[PDB]
Amino acid sequence: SRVPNGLKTMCECMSSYLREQGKALVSEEGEGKNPVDYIQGLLDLKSRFDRFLLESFNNDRLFKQTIAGDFEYFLNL
């Protein structure tokens, strides 16, 4: 947080990991993917990331913005 352009690439890598996890969670390949179990897994990740934000990123606006955009794009995919 002391050096400029640090939170930028931090949130960039966080969003990259979020995209990877999402593409792994909504992977079209596979028929019969329990619809309920799918969202349950995403719910666990979502709550864990919200807890991570308040327990580590001290509720920084940038991190919130990034995770929001990420979720939107991947679920729209």
CA distance readout (Å), 61 to 2, 7, 28, 42, 57: 16, 11, 32, 22, 9
Write the CB contacts of 72 (distance below 8 Å, at least 6 apart in sequence). Answer: none
Q: In angstroms, what is the resolution?
A: 7.9
Residue position matching structure tokens 């794009």: 73
Residue 6, burial from CB neighbour count under 10 angstroms (0-12, 13-18, 19+): exposed
From the list 51, 77, 50, the residue with the least C-alpha distance to 64 is 50
φ/ψ (deg, to 5) at 28: -60, -45
Please count the residues of the chain. 77
Residue 63, burial from CB neighbour count under 10 angstroms (0-12, 13-18, 19+): buried
From the list 13, 30, 29, 31, the residue with the least C-alpha distance to 70 is 13
CA distance readout (Å), 63 to 3, 4, 8, 58: 16, 15, 9, 10
- Cα–Cα dist 47/32, whole Å: 25
